[PDB]
Design a protein around this ligand. Structure first.
Ligand code: HEA
Ligand SMILES: CCCCC/C=C\C/C=C\C/C=C\C/C=C\CCCC(=O)O[C@H](COC(=O)CCCCCCCCCCCCCCCCC)COP(=O)(O)OCCN
Ligand SMILES: CCCCCC/C=C\CCCCCCCCCC(=O)O[C@H](COC(=O)CCCCCCCCCCCCCCC)COP(=O)(O)OC[C@@H](O)CO
Ligand SMILES: CCCCCCCCCCO[C@@H]1O[C@H](CO)[C@@H](O[C@H]2O[C@H](CO)[C@@H](O)[C@H](O)[C@H]2O)[C@H](O)[C@H]1O
Ligand SMILES: CCCCCCCCCCO[C@@H]1O[C@H](CO)[C@@H](O[C@H]2O[C@H](CO)[C@@H](O)[C@H](O)[C@H]2O)[C@H](O)[C@H]1O
Ligand SMILES: C[C@H](CCC(=O)O)[C@H]1CC[C@H]2[C@@H]3[C@H](O)C[C@@H]4C[C@H](O)CC[C@]4(C)[C@H]3C[C@H](O)[C@]12C
Ligand code: CUA
Ligand SMILES: [Cu+2]
Ligand SMILES: [Mg+2]
Ligand code: NA
Ligand code: NA
Ligand SMILES: [Zn+2]
Lengths: 73, 49, 94, 79, 144, 58, 84, 514, 227, 259, 46, 105, 43
């Protein structure tokens, strides 16, 4: 017994595009944050932590005692 | 009227997928290919010097 | 000094070159060197498209500076319309 | 301004990756200086800086070929 | 009905959902009963039967929208056949491994690899992330 | 000299179906046959030379 | 810009013939004079077997392999020096 | 009659057909060479036991694919068939010189085959750098035969360029301006300008190499005051324009394909597309030394070449986004040619982006002469130039032949090829980042896993190539004759039917000026 | 050296190589984002039955598609060029070492003080000692002091070669008649491997580079013993 | 029957003979350089000349005798010749780049100087200056020939064109003599290499251009040209001016600045 | 004139699909085989 | 550049032209469906009445089909448009595609 | 595009023959060379 309401009829393709370009942008920001955390910052911290108390002579003596060098026995 | 895809599509999909997986798994595992995976978590290091 | 002895095109042009030259003097363009100028293109005043056969391809630049040209065969008989802008064209065989 | 030589220092005349002319110029300078000294009776020791620099920078085969050509009279640079 | 190669320069019929009213009718020649149907169409369409209305539609058009837009099972054939041919490719690769390739170098022997792995750890290959970083030098085992 | 272009125009416009490279007459055919024989014979000789040069010899 | 002349107004064959005989060919004649006054051989320099000259990485495909195409015995030494 | 028609042709369609047949045969040669490369690398150790032969195979692979497959198919094949039809011209400007551009290529290819059969071949790389290519490290005839092969291919393409530029400038309808010609026609004109200017510089450089090898010149030999690096400049002053020559007709075909199967009357942003191709062509002449970032150039020169190279991304990006904007709102027809073009858009974009990585000369120190470069350029060549060729071939095969392909088989072919090329080349990025050099016949053991996968990929693409030949056979075997083609109002090359008559536009189109 | 199934760069051994890793991470994030955005937009264009086939005005949107890529390129170029000029910066070496390429091996000359030079050839696979690396070991390694700025000069006595050590971020072509300079500084002791990187004929694959980085005092005694 | 103005060319064998002549000349140079034999090369040179003669003969038949060169066709040939000249400019540009590369950065092997140690350049004020006056003069005389033809003057066209050709021959004979008299050779390092290859390709182009002028001379004697239609003459004059301009760049660069 | 139409504007016959299969097999097969036989040739020379 | 109401009014006027011919009917509908919209009922009404003046029942049905097609996945639009057209469909004796079975594949 | 039905239909069996012949034309000659590589390298 009930009539149907008038739906939006115009600009449906443009509306879809706008909505999903915005969503693509939001995802891109979400990805850049994930990648900075999971890759770029991770790498910066791995090198910083590695070198913070790194003892190059101790490293050398370990290598030398393992027998790896031509010039150092 | 049904066409080739209605008549044979299901069989082509099922048989082709089954064949493809079977032969690549065989190739990958049964004929001596050396993939040389990472030793990490796999190889026990052994004295060399 | 200045003598003659060099033929002119009027004297010595031949073949298709001579046909084009003689037609140009008459203001005629049988070999399609010039762009035809459009009429208003109504059904009453269609663009008249010469042909030596009973159909010819028309390209319609519907509006000035459109980069898209609309191409279609125009056949002998009743005027036809460009499918994009509707402007009328009529074949005039021979 | 005497010894303490470790290696050839940066030379603003030759700041780029191609160091060919640095080797060549110091080789020339050493031998021009040596020619001047041995002539007028002086001491080649004043030429030593050029000698150390070109020995540091120049491939052994380049020095060797240039020395042979000086001996042959076919060295194309001016000394 | 019958489209001929020599008709290529004439206006033609097409079923395209973006060109709903094509340049020609699907059927140009009419029988006696079809002519009478086109005459009847000049009167009230409420007096046409359903069958007459369908017939007028099928004189004008070949396929309806639903027919021209129907989806098909073609994807099954395409994907299955592609997998078949990729599978055939592994047969070629099996043939190559058997008849073309000889043994690989002795450096891939298990004992060589174990010794080479220890030597890489002794020289701290990629000790920041790539390789020796994954070895626990205190516990003498791969990190968990 | 005298202008004999009109005679040449009549010759090369004669309605005889000949292509322009033969339309001067029998001398065109001879020159064409010489050119094509040298080209095709020379090409075969080049292939012979390839065959010779493809193998070690001396 | 230019060097100074005149002419013009509707240049044509007469002006270009004027330039040919009045400027261009006199200039060729003057340079021909200048050249045939400075002709005559100069002394060839001492031969020095410089390694950047008289290059031979492959024999030449004519002669004995060791003579350049327009070899002039008077002024072109071989790698071993001037010919006798 | 057969000789007159097929050896003495003055017809743009028949000559285009000759080029397509030649390029397809060359593509088989180039593919076989590529499979030998990947067979040598498919497990650790040596397969051929002769790395001079490996180096000859690599070198010939590149020359065949570039000079005998891509350029003849895109410019000689699609260019000759389509350009006169797309402007309503009755043939090319110089229809007889056009036939000599074609017939110079079998002799050029014969010289390249001769180079590989005599002595030990030219195992030089397709760059042919001295002194490796000089007469001490490559004594004997092989390198000179390669040089002469390039000379004949170069003359063929220079005269072809003259023909295409003249035809496109001079033989349009009098009302049609250059901004009313289709984008494929633009892409061919710009390619031809790049060929005209760049190939003479290559010709000069390889002639200097010929005289250093045979007349005792020393352009490239320091003993005479010459310089190997001068050869590299001359080579790459041509070689960077050359890669834009290889892709530009592909860009033109992709524009037509995307427009057509989107159901559009026109590409999005036509004048932006013209601008972008012109900008790419211009910038393509001022970036060459990014092929030389490790030779020892001054830092400021490296900074300039980094910056100029990166600028090319801006016009290229306009074309990619304009293709996407052509799809936008389309009535999408998922034809096989559409699949090729969609694969093109994405995979070309991936390859162009790794080119931007390489443009940074600081990183290029570590990536130069590694497989990261090989991965980059096979994304733009094996998945851009080749995908455009396959798209164009499937799309226009019914015009050229009058017969239809089986679309299901063509989609199967696309699917197999897509898997194969990505399995082949994607892992090469990892090999390059981790330091594997290019032009190697064997590798340190660590690199085994990705080389194994890459070589398995190469066999998938082989299966696709074999199936392509069968698909062509089945079309000619079944003889399904074309009836109706849609969108002829914006695709003039179809309007004379399939195939068009030997002579088309004997009466020119009527186009008024208004 | 590389290790099995490696995806990215060898770990950095020098500060410049560490800079290159961070710059690559920055650039690859941009590469991933643009490639993924294009793939996504493709998929978006292709997944609706809605249509719009009439002419579309391009002016407005081409401003976005030129300006935003230009900004991104500047964001790549700025750190790119910073590293380029940091590489070039004056370092003041305390040692110069020459290397000459040859078919097919490298020679090294250390002639700051004494006439020290030797050849360096790949160890054949059949002569590797257990645990050694196929195609990478050499008989005579390039011993160098760690933690010191070293000038390397690179040339060739025959065809082009190229002297590379990826974990130090080095690659310098070896050109006859030319002496190319690069600088090397290892933050750590150890063994760092590279391979000839300009095709030089039939054994291009088989003339590797091995640096051995040790304390200065060990380098001095090694140098003396190699005379 | 066509109703456009373009030329549908009869099927022709000369593209194929030209392509095969290229195969024979290049395989012939290879045989001469490596297998001590001139045979293939002489066949290739002969078939090349035969091909050029019959092809350009046919173009004259198509135009003067058959009338196929409408204005539209002539306009295409103008573009074609201009584009051909542009490609030849870029070919010479590579040799100038080689010259400036070597002379601006002279290497140690040369003495680190330009001209190299042991090179005694020709005096640019003697025969090289004469050659410059000769080609410049010929650019004036060919312009006189062009205006005489446009003005319908057969005798003075022939006179001016003959003077132009005589000057081209004079240049070629002077250059041949200079080559013989030069104390340096093509094997004298990069100085001889750049000098002879660049001036040598230029001299080849002078010979080509002179031949083209001679073809125009005999066509003029046979009345082929009209006062308005004479593109072969125009093309030969453009090519001749190109040869003159290349010479001026060689003179300033290699003979003068490079001395 | 020349023959025109499908199957007539090509230098090879498509009148018999099996003869066509043979001809296409020889054509594409010869191009694909050639590099393998060039490698064999070079291997056998030394 | 132009309001929605102005656009719709131009299209109503186009189809309402009493002597609109067949070519103009097809040109109108084939142009209209290129736009990013489903035509308002008042436009479709005028087009259907043009079909009536042109004695073309089949094109009236096709026009209803292309309304449904332009709505894409928005399944609510076509039943709304048919609802709004019901008085016109009844007056002119136009059967819908669904009533004719033409929605079946 | 539309098109006529095949003038000379190629049945499934015919396609299997054409495909098999095509594949063998590529595989057999290269397979023969690669199978015999060792024989060549022993020369
Ligand atoms: C079709 C062939 C082709 C094409 C078109 C290109 C395109 C590019 N190439 Fe590639 N390249 C090759 C084929 C090609 N290349 C070959 C064969 C080699 C090796 C030669 C050899 O040594 O043998 C090579 C080598 C090569 C090098 C040398 C690396 C080395 O040897 O160390 C470099 C360096 O800069 C380079 C860079 C680029 C760039 C910047 C582009 C640009 O034109 C790419 C532009 C495209 C995009 C960027 C993608 C689309 C853009 C967008 C979606 C917009 C937004 C993007 C951004 C903001 C970044 N290429
Ligand atoms: C004489 C007055 C007019 C000058 C010009 C005369 C003829 C030149 C003809 C053609 C030249 C073209 C190629 C140039 C190659 C070198 C020739 C350079 C000019 C020349 O003639 O150089 C002579 C040496 O010639 C030599 O080696 C041998 C020369 C003969 C063999 C040449 C073979 C090489 C051919 C290569 C062609 C490649 C073309 C490629 C075009 C590609 C287009 C896309 C110099 O003689 P010299 O004794 O060394 O010194 C003089 C000492 N008194
Ligand atoms: C050791 C020496 C070796 C030498 C080898 C080369 C030898 C010399 C070749 C010299 C070139 C001769 C060219 C002759 C061309 C004659 C045909 C001609 O000139 O044809 C003219 C058209 O021009 C046309 O095609 C113009 C056609 C273009 C001609 C271009 C010629 C120059 C290029 C030659 C090749 C150079 C290669 C160099 C490579 C390193 C005909 O039209 P018109 O003149 O208007 O006449 C019509 C009127 O009569 C009507 O009233
Ligand atoms: C595609 C472009 C191709 C460019 C054309 C190249 C043509 C090359 C022809 C060379 O001809 C050679 O000239 C030499 C002149 O020096 C001759 O030397 C001959 O004559 C000399 C003295 O005149 C002596 O050295 C010897 O007796 C003898 O070899 C030589 O035999 C002869 O063949
Ligand atoms: C990179 C491209 C190559 C891709 C892979 C090729 C796949 C293989 C196709 C089969 O090739 C055949 O294989 C046979 C072996 O299966 C060979 O027979 C050989 O081996 C047989 C069995 O040992 C003997 O009966 C024969 O005489 C002997 O020639 C035969 O010559 C060769 O044509
Ligand atoms: C024969 C001819 C007259 C014109 C005609 O009637 O043919 C005349 C006029 C111009 C003359 C030529 C020109 O005067 C140029 C040359 C002048 C030289 O003194 C003789 C040869 C030379 C090449 C002349 C030969 C001949 O006498 C020509 C060609
Ligand atoms: Cu040495 Cu590659
Ligand atoms: Cu590049
Ligand atoms: Mg390199
Ligand atoms: Na290998
Ligand atoms: Na003129
Ligand atoms: Zn219009």
């Amino acid at each position: 017994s009930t009539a149907l309401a008038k739906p939006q009829m115009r600009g449906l393709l443009a509306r879809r595009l706008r909505f999903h370009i915005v969503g693509a942008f939001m995802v891109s920001l979400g990805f850049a944050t994930f990648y900075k955390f999971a890759v770029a910052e991770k790498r910066k911290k791995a090198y910083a932590d590695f070198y913070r108390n790194y003892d190059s002579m101790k490293d050398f003596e370990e290598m030398r005692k393992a027998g790896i060098f031509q010039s150092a026995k | 009227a049904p066409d080739f895809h209605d008549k044979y599509g299901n069989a082509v999909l099922a048989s082709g997928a089954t064949f493809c997986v079977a032969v690549w798994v065989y190739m990958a595992t049964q004929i001596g290919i050396e993939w040389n995976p990472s030793p990490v978590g796999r190889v026990t290091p052994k004295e060399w010097r | 000094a200045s003598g003659g002895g060099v033929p002119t095109d009027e004297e010595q042009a031949t073949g298709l070159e001579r046909e084009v030259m003689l037609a140009a003097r008459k203001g005629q363009d049988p070999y399609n060197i010039l762009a035809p100028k459009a009429t208003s293109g109504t059904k009453e005043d269609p663009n008249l498209v010469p042909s030596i056969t009973n159909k010819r391809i028309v390209g319609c630049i519907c509006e000035e500076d459109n980069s898209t040209v609309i191409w279609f065969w125009l056949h002998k008989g009743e005027a036809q319309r460009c499918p994009s802008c509707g402007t009328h064209y009529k074949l005039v065989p021979h | 301004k005497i010894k303490n030589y470790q290696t050839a220092p940066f030379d603003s005349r030759f700041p780029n990756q191609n160091q060919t002319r640095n080797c060549w110029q110091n080789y020339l300078d050493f031998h021009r200086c040596e020619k001047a000294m041995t002539a007028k009776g002086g001491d080649v020791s004043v030429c030593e800086w050029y000698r150390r620099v070109y020995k540091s920078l120049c491939p052994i085969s380049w020095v060797s070929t240039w020395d042979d050509r000086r001996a042959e009279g076919t060295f194309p640079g001016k000394i | 009905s019958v489209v001929k190669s020599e008709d290529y320069a004439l206006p033609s019929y097409v079923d395209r959902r973006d060109y709903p009213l094509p340049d020609v009718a699907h059927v140009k020649n009419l029988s006696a009963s079809q002519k009478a149907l086109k005459e009847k169409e000049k009167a009230s369409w409420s007096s046409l039967s359903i069958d007459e209305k369908v017939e007028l539609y099928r004189l004008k058009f070949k396929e309806s929208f639903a027919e021209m837009n129907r989806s098909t099972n073609e994807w099954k054939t395409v994907v299955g056949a592609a997998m078949f041919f990729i599978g055939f490719t592994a047969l070629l690769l099996i043939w190559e491994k058997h008849y073309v390739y000889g043994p690989i170098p002795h450096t891939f022997e298990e004992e060589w690899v174990a010794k080479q792995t220890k030597r890489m750890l002794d020289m701290k290959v990629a000790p920041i992330q790539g390789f020796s970083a994954k070895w626990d030098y205190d516990k003498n085992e791969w990190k968990k | 000299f005298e202008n004999r272009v009109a005679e040449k125009q009549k010759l090369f416009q004669e309605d005889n179906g000949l292509p322009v490279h033969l339309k001067g007459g029998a001398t065109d055919n001879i020159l064409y046959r010489v050119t094509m024989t040298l080209c095709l014979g020379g090409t075969l000789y080049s292939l012979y030379c390839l065959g010779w040069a493809s193998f070690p010899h001396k | 810009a230019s060097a100074a002349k005149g002419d013009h107004g509707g240049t044509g064959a007469r002006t270009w013939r004027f330039l040919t005989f009045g400027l261009a060919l006199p200039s060729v004649a003057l340079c021909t004079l200048n050249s045939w006054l400075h002709s005559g051989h100069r002394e060839r320099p001492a031969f020095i077997p410089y390694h950047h000259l008289r290059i031979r990485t492959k024999p030449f495909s004519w002669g004995d392999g060791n003579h350049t195409f327009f070899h002039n015995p008077r002024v072109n030494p071989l790698p071993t020096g001037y010919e006798k | 009659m057969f000789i007159n028609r097929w050896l003495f042709s003055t017809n743009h369609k028949d000559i285009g057909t000759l080029y397509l047949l030649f390029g397809a045969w060359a593509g088989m040669v180039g593919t076989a060479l590529s499979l030998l490369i990947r067979a040598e690398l498919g497990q650790p150790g040596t397969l051929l036991g002769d790395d001079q032969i490996y180096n000859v195979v690599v070198t010939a692979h590149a020359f065949v694919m570039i000079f005998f497959m891509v350029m003849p198919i895109m410019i000689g094949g699609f260019g000759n068939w389509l350009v006169p039809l797309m402007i309503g011209a009755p043939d090319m400007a110089f229809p007889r010189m056009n036939n000599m551009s074609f017939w110079l290529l079998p002799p050029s290819f014969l010289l390249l085959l001769a180079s590989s059969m005599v002595e030990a071949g030219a195992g030089t790389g397709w760059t042919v750098y001295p002194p490796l290519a000089g007469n001490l490290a490559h004594a004997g005839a092989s390198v000179d035969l390669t040089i002469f092969s390039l000379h004949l291919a170069g003359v063929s393409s220079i005269l072809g360029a003259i023909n295409f530029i003249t035809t496109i400038i001079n033989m349009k309808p009098p009302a049609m301006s250059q901004y009313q010609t289709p984008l494929f026609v633009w892409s061919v004109m710009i390619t031809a300008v790049l060929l005209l200017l760049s190939l003479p510089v290559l010709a000069a450089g390889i002639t200097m190499l010929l005289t250093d090898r045979n007349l005792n010149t020393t352009f490239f030999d320091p003993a005479g005051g010459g310089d190997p690096i001068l050869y590299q400049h001359l080579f790459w002053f041509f070689g960077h324009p050359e890669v834009y020559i290889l892709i530009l007709p592909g860009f033109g075909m992709i524009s037509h394909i995307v427009t057509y199967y989107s159901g559009k009357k026109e590409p999005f942003g036509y004048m932006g597309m013209v601008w972008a191709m012109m900008s790419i062509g211009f910038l393509g002449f001022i970036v060459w030394a990014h092929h030389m970032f490790t030779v020892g150039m001054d830092v400021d020169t490296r900074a300039y070449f980094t910056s100029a190279t990166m600028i090319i991304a801006i016009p290229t990006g306009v074309k990619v986004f304009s293709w996407l904007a052509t799809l936008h709102g389309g009535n999408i027809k998922w034809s096989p040619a559409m699949m090729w073009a969609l694969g093109f858009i994405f995979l070309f974009t991936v390859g162009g982006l790794t080119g931007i990585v390489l443009a940074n000369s600081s990183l290029d120190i570590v990536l130069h002469d590694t497989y990261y470069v090989v991965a980059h350029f096979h994304y733009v060549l094996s998945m851009g130039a080749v995908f455009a060729i396959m798209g164009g071939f499937v799309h226009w095969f019914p015009l050229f032949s009058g017969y239809t392909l089986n679309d299901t088989w063509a989609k199967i072919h696309f699917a197999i090829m897509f898997v194969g090329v990505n399995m082949t080349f994607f892992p090469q990025h990892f090999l390059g980042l981790s330091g594997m050099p290019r032009r190697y016949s064997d590798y340190p053991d660590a690199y085994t896993m990705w080389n194994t996968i890459s070589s398995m990929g190469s066999f998938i693409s082989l299966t696709a190539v074999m199936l392509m030949v069968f698909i062509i056979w089945e079309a000619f075997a079944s003889k399904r004759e074309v009836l109706t083609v849609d969108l002829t109002t914006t695709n003039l090359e179809w309007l004379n039917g399939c195939p068009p008559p030997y002579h088309t536009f004997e009466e020119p189109t009527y186009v008024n000026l208004k | 050296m590389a290790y099995p199934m490696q995806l990215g760069f060898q770990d950095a051994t020098s500060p410049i190589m560490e800079e290159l890793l961070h710059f690559h991470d920055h650039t690859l994030m941009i590469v991933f984002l643009i490639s993924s955005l294009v793939l996504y937009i493709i998929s978006l264009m292709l997944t609706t039955k809605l249509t719009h086939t009439s002419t579309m005005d391009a002016q407005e949107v081409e401003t976005i598609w030129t300006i935003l890529p230009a900004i991104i390129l500047i964001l790549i170029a700025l750190p790119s060029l910073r590293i380029l000029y940091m590489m070039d910066e004056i370092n003041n070496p305390s040692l110069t070492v020459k290397t000459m390429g040859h078919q097919w091996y490298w020679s090294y000359e250390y002639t700051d003080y004494e006439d020290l030079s030797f050849d360096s050839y790949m160890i054949p696979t059949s002569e590797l000692k257990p645990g050694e690396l196929r195609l990478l070991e050499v008989d005579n390694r390039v011993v160098l002091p760690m933690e010191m700025t070293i000038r390397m000069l690179v040339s060739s006595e025959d065809v082009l070669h190229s002297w590379a050590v990826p974990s130090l971020g080095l690659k310098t072509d070896a050109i006859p008649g030319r002496l190319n300079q690069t600088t090397l500084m290892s933050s750590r002791p150890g063994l760092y491997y590279g391979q000839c990187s300009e095709i030089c004929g039939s054994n291009h694959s088989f003339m590797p580079i091995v640096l051995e980085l040790v304390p200065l005092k060990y380098f001095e005694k090694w140098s003396a013993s190699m005379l | 029957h066509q109703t456009h103005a373009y030329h549908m060319v009869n099927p022709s064998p000369w593209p194929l003979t030209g392509a095969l002549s290229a195969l024979l000349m290049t395989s012939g140079l290879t045989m001469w350089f490596h297998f001590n034999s001139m045979t293939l090369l002489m066949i290739g040179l002969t078939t090349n000349m035969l091909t050029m003669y019959q092809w350009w003969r046919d173009v004259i038949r198509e135009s003067t005798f058959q009338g196929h060169h409408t204005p539209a066709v002539q306009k295409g040939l103008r573009y074609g010749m201009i584009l051909f000249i542009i490609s030849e400019v870029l070919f010479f540009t590579g040799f100038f780049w080689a010259f400036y590369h070597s002379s601006l950065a002279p290497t140690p092997e040369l003495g680190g100087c330009w001209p190299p140690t042991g090179i005694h350049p020709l005096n640019p004020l003697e025969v090289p200056l004469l050659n410059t006056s000769v080609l410049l003069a010929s650019g004036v005389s060919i312009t006189w020939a062009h205006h005489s033809l446009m003005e319908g003057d057969r005798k003075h066209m022939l006179q001016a064109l003959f003077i132009t050709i005589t000057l081209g021959v004079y240049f070629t004979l002077l250059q041949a003599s200079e080559y013989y008299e030069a104390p340096f050779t093509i094997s004298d390092g990069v100085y001889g290499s750049t000098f002879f290859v660049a001036t040598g390709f230029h001299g080849l182009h002078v010979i080509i251009g002179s031949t083209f002028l001679i073809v125009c001379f005999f066509r003029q004697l046979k009345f082929h040209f009209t006062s308005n239609h004479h593109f072969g003459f125009e093309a030969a004059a453009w090519y001749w001016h190109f040869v003159d301009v290349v010479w001026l760049f060689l003179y300033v660069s290699i003979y003068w600045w490079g001395s | 004139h020349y023959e025109e139409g499908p199957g007539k504007n090509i230098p090879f016959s498509v009148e018999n699909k099996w003869r066509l299969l043979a001809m296409m097999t020889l054509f594409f097969g010869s191009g694909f085989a050639a590099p393998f036989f060039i490698v064999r040739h070079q291997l056998l020379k030394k | 550049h132009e309001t929605d109401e102005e656009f719709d009014a131009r299209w109503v006027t186009y189809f309402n032209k009493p002597d609109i011919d067949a070519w103009e009917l097809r040109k109108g509908m084939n142009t209209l469906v290129g736009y990013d919209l489903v035509p308002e009922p008042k436009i479709i009404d005028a087009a259907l009445r043009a079909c009536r003046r042109l004695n073309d029942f089949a094109s009236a049905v096709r026009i209803l089909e292309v309304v449904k097609d332009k709505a894409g996945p928005h399944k609510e639009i076509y039943p709304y448009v048919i609802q709004e057209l019901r008085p016109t469909l009844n007056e002119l004796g136009i059967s819908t595609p669904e009533e004719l079975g033409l929605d079946k594949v | 595009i539309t098109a006529k039905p095949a003038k000379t239909p190629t049945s499934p069996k015919e396609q299997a023959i054409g495909l098999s012949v095509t594949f063998l034309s590529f595989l057999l000659p290269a397979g023969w060379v690669l199978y015999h590589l060792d024989n060549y390298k022993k020369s």
